[model samples]
Target chain A: IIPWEERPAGCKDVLWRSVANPIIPRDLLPTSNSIFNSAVVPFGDGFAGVFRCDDTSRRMRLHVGFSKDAINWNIKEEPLKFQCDDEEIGTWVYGYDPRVCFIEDRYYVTWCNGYHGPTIGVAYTFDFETFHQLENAFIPFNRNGVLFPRKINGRFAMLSRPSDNGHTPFGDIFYSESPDMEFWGRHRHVMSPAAFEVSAWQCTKIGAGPIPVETPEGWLLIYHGVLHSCNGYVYSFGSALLDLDEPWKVKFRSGPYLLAPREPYECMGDVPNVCFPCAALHDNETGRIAIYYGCADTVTGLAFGYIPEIIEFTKRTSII
Target chain B: VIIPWEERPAGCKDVLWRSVANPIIPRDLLPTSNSIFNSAVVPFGDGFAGVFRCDDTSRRMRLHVGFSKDAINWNIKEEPLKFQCDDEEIGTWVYGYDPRVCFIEDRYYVTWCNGYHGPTIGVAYTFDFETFHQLENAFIPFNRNGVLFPRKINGRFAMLSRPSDNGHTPFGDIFYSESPDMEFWGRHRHVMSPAAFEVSAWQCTKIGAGPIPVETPEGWLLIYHGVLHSCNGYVYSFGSALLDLDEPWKVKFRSGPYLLAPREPYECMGDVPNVCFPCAALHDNETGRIAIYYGCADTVTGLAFGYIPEIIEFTKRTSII
Candidate 1:
């Protein structure tokens, strides 16, 4: 069942894609239109998540789902109850790609808010039922805003991609520090595409995936690389380790993709050839990670890997 | 005197014109030829000489020399370029591709991507087109598209290339290196990179310096190839940039639109599709004309022409930010 656990005679690389994927299929949605993307975290005894539900009207909204095994999920037909006292967040034209991180006994959700351009929006939930929308997290030209698992240097840390304004937008990963998680500033460049790494899925731009998972070695980050191909943009996953203390200096980076658009759910739908990993959960007892991603930009999918194995793979490709 | 050195003409974004005589040198030149692409052109005595990369029956590549008096009609030689050095001889066994030519002082220098232990750049020089002196491998493995500047900058030799570790996943940043002599190079710097503005898919992925830099009053005009990956595959095209005169690492401006793309059937259909990779540029200062020679779809060599003044103006208005 777990053949990848032990390295084959001469084989060292070990990564497996889930067979029963698209766990949250488009048919499971209320309107049965599409599932844009999603993020998840351990809730009480199981898992709770926020999924981007795009209805038939082409409007994107958010919904909460629950799972006991973290594999099968039960999502409601209605949008999550979000309350923003004065902020104009839900009023944004559209929203998608939500990233969830659990810290200080609460869950924080950051997503691409299509206000003026594509900006970052923030909200928090103590329980799965009611949520408090904070405010627009960052200004325009930003998306894929993901939070660090914990505060670094006594401040909140987030990874974002600020795209240039144009029909064909270019992007690079940036780190921002916020004293109160509400106002993000001190933007610093984290990583950009190298000359040779532009061939396939990561050539055009990259964005933060899931939330950074803290390990003894460092903060293991899984990000998606967007390669603009003849058809459209293809997205795949790559892993890297950042300094535990700095959380910005990249220590190890995987030379090739960890996961690509191979499966049908990952290769066909609203957008084709996309495996946008949005959320991850780590099991301390087994050291296993459950990666939940959007497949083909139309349905939710999942993949799993051992933390130790992933970290080892990244270290082998480390320049440092 | 320099009309193109000024701003562009009204609504004239077209920079290069395709020649009626494209795929000028086809695959039928030699019995072992599978394709003839990625040739480097330089003025030899009074005519033009091109180091054509010929893909043979085994799909392995070897360099063949072609000569033309008017830069159009070519007389190709039957023999391959024999290496004078032992290491280069071994490097060519795996194959060679993407040759670039530059004329310095009294010698014609040629640099190419060689598949030795891994893909690396190889250099050679010739006083005349007949004989060649091969230098040691220019750099270690995992590098390609090495192009030398025509004249010494700040009393040293300079070249541009993109570093690569694996062949499949190529990176996007362009690097510059300086050498006191042609043999040894150091003082590397990050020069131009893929523009953030995603105007064309060809340039949206990555860019590499192409041909030899054309000297103008404004700066050094550089022709380069940009790659755009589509659902089908990668489409390669050519664009221009203006580098700072003294400091060649600094880019003054870059063109927004592509100069040449795969519009012809010969350029659109091949082992690879939709590729127009520029490898050589001929600038006749007296006539104020510039001609570009490039590989079409990795199958055949093609030519295009443009006025020098119009090209300079195209580069100046290319800045998107």
Candidate 2:
């Protein structure tokens, strides 16, 4: 679905267009920084992580900021990792474009190595306070490589959109089987580029969400659909569902766009007109799904939904 | 208007493209080695002057190649002049991109320079059989200097050029009325960049391209351009005209682009673009105009024109050469 959709709940003041002139709100983000895909893992007892970007720096490096709740965030100010140096002067390096996975008692940190043109790097820590960068875990240029919740075929599995070296001129999602989390097995294309060909901004690339949830009907996968154009860069969030056994097989997907660049915060700031979500949280008690995203490559933002309602919306829509 | 406007005619094939792509065509050159604009005056057979790639060696510096047959059928050969260099291991120090002219005996004696990774030495040669041979590397590198015209400058030799300096960028607009051999240039002024914008595809960078001024009806019709690129890798090329004969820098630049790499595979590919470095021109005696031959496409060469009548038209348009 087109990202600029005006749904009531999933978007707030900043990410939604209750006020259209300035889609992304100001409160969530200060200015100059862009908050793209964000993943949150519980830190100690009171803090949580909201990893994002303050691209105003010479090099746009991914940084892990702290947040008490999903709403209020504290930027670390200093870079979590300085991925760029003399040896690697290429643009997409210096540790950039992050996606977080909150796994068993740990946070599996995954981000892009912007220096090497465009590649993916993975690291993990038991707790947010004790962060250890795993060695030799970087995969070469997987658009959005994230770990699946459980093992498949008795092996740790992760989902990735393996770029065919920069072919198809577009991206597709895939699943890779791995003996250990660090090493991956054969990869298969799970999802291909959408057919709609909407004129939205992110007409270039697409990324998946934090975690996929299993349901009675199938696997409810929350993914991001970026509509890119040189006209003016923009990104919005969207979702789809997959079959339980064959996660690659689709069950039902949203149509007419699930979400869009709404909210004043999502539309304004460092690089305006973007609302990207990489992490989603399900409140078991409330049966609610909360997606935290970076607004316009600048600040953090939040959106809530009744899990069942979003599922229904996906089922009702058809492939364009 | 905009490039690639469908109804392109016969002469516009090289420049018609929908959007900017790789290997920009012949006319679309960046200011790299492939586009060094040099000047030359051939005194043998033809009285007209022709500018070509000065470093025209297999490994020697390449120069532009052009001929003006009675000022009508102007023909130019491929890019990168081919000449013999002294150092076989290092090959030719074909650093000669531009040349100043002198008429000795019945032949055309040329004085040019070699450009290493750094500044290089000035060299001399004589053109016979429509070709030239290396005489010598005039002096050491970074020495402030220029060659002169023998007997052409009022029966005596007059060498007008500049020497090298480590401190300042480079001095400009200098002249020395000397003996026929052109041993020295006495006076000088580090002229400002001839092109208008300090940052453009042409004349956007530094100052260079002179010493081969034409005697025009209006004045000493001069041709020079400026160049500039602070950090990002991009080159600019443009040209201008001088007013005074002896004292240059009393000049009027074309303000904008006169000739740029609007279309050329070798011009816009690799490294940088908006760079058209030419060191030579062949003036049409009959037409009272000039035809320029330059290296382009980073590895190829081409020819373009600017007539006296068209000079106003050239001035009206942008000078991206």
Candidate 3:
């Protein structure tokens, strides 16, 4: 069973924060400046995932971690290194914001890898220890690569956000599938941020967050959206549903963010005003889920909820 | 350095003013050129030798060599510039643009935004204008505006660059990189970021180095471009800043307002409209005079004249930092 906290008595919202919030501390390892924006999944009766731990020099790095219980994690002090055959592909530049998914037998890890610029980096591992790198999914200037759990029409599908090189002011979700885990094509636009007039919280840009959780109704896609203010950017996350057979096609999208930077931990430190959801663990039988998110680029927090109610809320309040 | 000169106009309070003969070089200086701008020029022989960004009719950016006696006019060659290298992999065909030429101790160093897998700084040197010898790609891909200082800094080759993305990168900061031997680049330092929109909106989006820095008694005079993402698209304007004499990355003075912006019709219309790009400058230490060669609307070349002392005063007087 994944980490869980019972809903508080007076809570009316669909999702409630973990009473023991910030399950992972920023300085879990030495030389780590801030640790947040991570991914975790079920593995061999325990948990395994990758974490984005920015170092003292503020260099973004991905480190492997595991826990008997998903809440208390021991992220390896030594960063994760992928073994690749090609020298050019093997050369390590930088990587961040990772997502882990299990399809059939092996677990595939996708992240924003530094190619020429930020692009989708792909790799796989039978065991979390020995990860093998593969070709980058697309050209430079892309991020937020979240893969589907299973093949869609005999091809591996993924959701991505194509962006510019710098702190991209604009972004939109797109979908592309690969045959044999390389040579990606059949690109399709998924959705754009809701208009400011319609929904101010998600007006600036948006990206797919965690792996699409499979469901009877559709794929429950949890994603993050940005709101740019006069002072700075405020990041929050909401929910949406995509057609399972055609994941790029949005069936429903929430009008308001499910979670925002409300607590002091969420609104203060390193990068202020952020609650970026990157990974989620859901129990299919009970329709329960707990989301792992980065708070202000400092620490990790968890929010638990039920899947059926999340779907009902997404369908009830969808703007498009 | 014997270079171009001009007198101050009567009704001008500005430190720098446009050349009377503005946009002296037309768009199609070469037969196949669609637009020619974003160029670099330096004092070579009696006059200047330039590596101009002559985007051909096919809309492909290629570097063309040009020489001029007056720095205002030019005799541009037909063929595109090429570099000679031993490594076949590094010496392959390139997607190059926005070149900067600097005369170091021995040879003229030409640096540009080069594409290997992605855009990075391409380094080359030429003793004469005929054949050029190239070094390794200075850094990894996704970098631009690799302009070198005229002389070595602390016995190492120093350059100004912006580590950016492949497309119209939204944010940028002028960065400094030093190399022991032009091949292996390291010691990256942040030079400056865009000024706040509340202070100077023109430079809030991004900024990149303009001409090779001019070493002065006060410090190094840095002329650079700042971009503002206007409703139409983007507006490029040129500005001035002063960097530390020894450590160039330590910015001493920055302009609160742009020194020059797109005003004339020639600068308001072209392949990309409303752009005043500063790429090269010729400063005569004896006369204390500086002639700024800039691109107008990515269409043609233009000149702006000023005194180095006056520009330095303007930079120091209205200092943002």
Q: A1-320, model 3: which lDDT tens digit per residue?
A: 98888899989899999999888888889899888977899999899999999999999999999899999998999999999996766778999989998998899999999865687889999989999998777555679989999999998888988777778887778777766775565556688888999887888999999899989888999999999999999999999999988887899999988999999999998999999999999998888899999999999999999999999999999998
Residue range B221-250, candidate 2, lDDT tens digits: 545544555475545454555444554434
lDDT over C-alpha atoms for residue B266 of model 1: 96
Candidate 3, B184-285: lDDT as tens digits: 454455688899999988899999999999999999999999999977899999889999989998899998889999999999999899999899998888
For candidate 1, write residues A1-320 as lDDT tens digits: 11112333565544566667767778786585888576888788777888898888878887898888777778888877668785435565677879888877688988887754566778888887988877666545568889997888888888887653343335667777766765444445577764444335666778898899899888989999887766778888889898898776788877778889988888989889989889887766677777778888898887778899899888886534
lDDT of 1 by residue, B1-321 (tens): 221122234575567777777777787678788888877877777677878898888898888888878766677777788767654333345678888888898798888887654566788888887888777555544568898989999998888887654445334667677666665554455576676545655687778888888888888888999888777778898988888899887788888888888889999998888999998877778866787888898888888878878888877776543
Candidate whose TM-score is highest: 3
True contacts kept of 3: 0.02
CA lDDT of each candidate?
0.76, 0.49, 0.87
Interface RMSD (Cα, Å) for model 2: 28.8
Task: State which candidate has the highest DockQ.
Answer: 3
Ranking by lDDT: 3, 1, 2
DockQ for each of the predicted structures, in order? 0.02, 0.01, 0.04
Model 1 scores a C-alpha lDDT of 0.76
